[PDB]
Amino acid sequence: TIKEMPQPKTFGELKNLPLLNTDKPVQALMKIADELGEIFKFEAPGLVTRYLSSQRLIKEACDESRFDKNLSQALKFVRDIAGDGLVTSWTHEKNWKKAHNILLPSFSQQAMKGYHAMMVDIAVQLVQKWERLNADEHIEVPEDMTRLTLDTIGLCGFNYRFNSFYRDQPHPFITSMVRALDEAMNKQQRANPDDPAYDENKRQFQEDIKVMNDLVDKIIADRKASGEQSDDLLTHMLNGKDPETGEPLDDENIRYQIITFLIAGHVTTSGLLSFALYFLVKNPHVLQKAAEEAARVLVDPVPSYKQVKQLKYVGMVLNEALRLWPTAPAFSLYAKEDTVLGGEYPLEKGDELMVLIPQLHRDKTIWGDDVEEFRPERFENPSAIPQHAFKPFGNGQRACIGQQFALHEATLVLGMMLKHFDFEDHTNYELDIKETLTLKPEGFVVKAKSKKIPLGGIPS
């Protein structure tokens, strides 16, 4: 059967574009998806795309045989920041597979074990910051989580210490990065993007990128110092070669991968930890159960690699946080050839799709009517999940390469947090999600009372 696709309000020649005149576009698309269902067509000037919400359709979309990764109009703009790095590359581009085969070992199981000691190093610093707060002080959660995840990838991946916890205002890299990423997101709303009204937006974007590359200059210059016994993500960028081609990365592409992993390797993990702690203080019984698991397993002054993989409820808690609000909320696709989607929606070649991940994770077909509630107990048995129903890390060979890096870090930090502190919703925070392509709760503050359990490190 062939069915016609529902389409939201059209505003003449701008088509659907004025519908996204909000600083919360993903959440607006969720509102739309509620009123139109599993799929709807979205039209902008020059561009058309189809948003998906149902596990049924989306599981067909993840067929690598039928569909390859498309670059969103978002990603085409982020490409101005990250070039042809792993995230913003075409699959058919010759720098993807190259950098993929070169860098994939950096996220192997034996690689991950090397990162732990450094993950703890920055984790210790976060814990000790909260341990040293005075009585009348609030914890700006997403701000401290950003400090944590930036230093982690900065140290694990490049042996470079941002020293975020030694700073008042965010590191100049964070400031420029957000503005740069805010531009790409806000740029999607501009009929005539080259109208000189935006020449100011183009000038600040230039500055932001100048700052970020100045930091990359620091990282490269500091490695050639040296910089010797290191076998981290940066080492493989410089010395490693692609098997198929026998070629290393260029002068240019290397810089792009650094920018890529500095952004991608922290921004969504900052959001995950922020969302996770938010739900825990909004569901204290879940908080209790989780904090009880933390007290049970974390028996040494600092967690071991073995212990972090024993915290499965903490891992469950994070998955459930990734379910309700996937910090990387969407990824695009295109049909490799002509086909029909869901056996009822004909697709031409070159047609773009959008996997609306938050709406996907809300498919009542898979999780029940119990959707909007926060229950980590959904993930007690992973094999009970009709997969392609839970994809917070994308799909296929273009799925998140740092998925295990993220979850291990997050579980570790969240674990140490529960072991060492109790938490009170000090301001009774109503959830306010800020969009910057990625998702993150904004203005969310807490109070932390110390359980008087000391530390003692640090290995590496």
Which residues are known binding-site members for (9Z)-hexadecenoate? 51
Among 25, 157, 415, 441, binds ligand PLM (CB under 6 A): 25
Coil, strand, or helix at residue 450? strand
360 in contact with ligand HEM (CB under 6 A): no
By annotation, the residues acting in catalysis are 268, 393, 400
Complex with ligand PLM: residue 152 or 283, whichever CB lies closer: 152
Cβ-Cβ contacts under 8 Å for 234 (sequence gap 6 or more): 157, 158, 159, 219, 223, 258
265 in contact with ligand HEM (CB under 6 A): yes
Q: Are 103 and 236 in contact (CB under 8 A)?
A: yes
Angle at 371 between CA 413 and CA 273, to 5 degrees: 15
Which of ligand HEM, ligand PLM, Ni ion, none sits in contact with 405, Cβ below 5 to 8 A by type? ligand HEM
Q: Are 342 and 57 in contact (CB under 8 A)?
A: yes
| Part of the chain binding ligand HEM (CB under 6 A), chosen from 130-138, 263-271, 336-344, 427-435 | 263-271
Complex with ligand HEM: residue 70 or 283, whichever CB lies closer: 70
Taking residue 259's Cβ as centre, other Cβ atoms within 10 Å add up to 25
Q: Minimal CA–CA distance to 148: which of 273, 319, 234, 264?
A: 273
Among 51, 160, 173, 331, binds ligand HEM (CB under 6 A): 331
Q: Minimal CA–CA distance to 146: which of 116, 126, 128, 132?
A: 126
Q: How far is the CB of 14 from ligand HEM (least distance, A)?
A: 26
237 in contact with ligand HEM (CB under 6 A): no
Complex with ligand HEM: residue 15 or 320, whichever CB lies closer: 320
Among 55, 176, 268, 359, binds ligand HEM (CB under 6 A): 268
406 in contact with ligand HEM (CB under 6 A): yes
Q: What are phi and psi of 260, to 5 degrees?
A: -55, -55
What burial letters (b/e) apply to 148-162, b meaning 16+ CB within 10 Å? bbbbbbbbbbbbbeb
Q: How far is the CB of 229 from ligand PLM (least distance, A)?
A: 28
78 in contact with ligand PLM (CB under 6 A): yes
Applying CB under 6 A, the site for ligand PLM has a residue count of 19
Cβ-Cβ contacts under 8 Å for 110 (sequence gap 6 or more): none
393 in contact with ligand HEM (CB under 6 A): yes
Taking residue 206's Cβ as centre, other Cβ atoms within 10 Å add up to 11
DSSP 78-113: HHHHHTT-SSS--TTSHHHHHHHHHHGGGGSHHHHH
Which of ligand HEM, ligand PLM, Ni ion, none sits in contact with 269, Cβ below 5 to 8 A by type? ligand HEM
CA distance 272 to 251: 33
Among 19, 39, 57, 87, binds ligand PLM (CB under 6 A): 87
Which pair of tokens denotes residue 322? 């990734």
CA distance 303 to 297: 9
CA distance 116 to 118: 5
32 in contact with ligand PLM (CB under 6 A): no
Complex with Ni ion: residue 338 or 424, whichever CB lies closer: 338
Binding to ligand HEM (CB under 6 A): which residues in 269-328? 269, 272, 326-328
Which of ligand PLM, Ni ion, ligand HEM, none sits in contact with 234, Cβ below 5 to 8 A by type? none
146 in contact with ligand PLM (CB under 6 A): no
Which letter does DSSP use for residue 298 in this model?
Answer: -
Which of ligand HEM, Ni ion, ligand PLM, none sits in contact with 338, Cβ below 5 to 8 A by type? Ni ion
CA distance 380 to 6: 37
Complex with ligand HEM: residue 8 or 271, whichever CB lies closer: 271
Complex with ligand PLM: residue 57 or 185, whichever CB lies closer: 185
Q: Which positions touch ligand HEM (CB under 6 A)?
A: 69, 86-87, 100, 153, 260-261, 264-265, 268-269, 272, 326-328, 331, 392-394, 398, 400-402, 405-406
Q: Which positions touch ligand PLM (CB under 6 A)?
A: 20, 25-26, 72, 74, 78, 82, 87-88, 185, 188, 260, 263-264, 328-330, 437-438
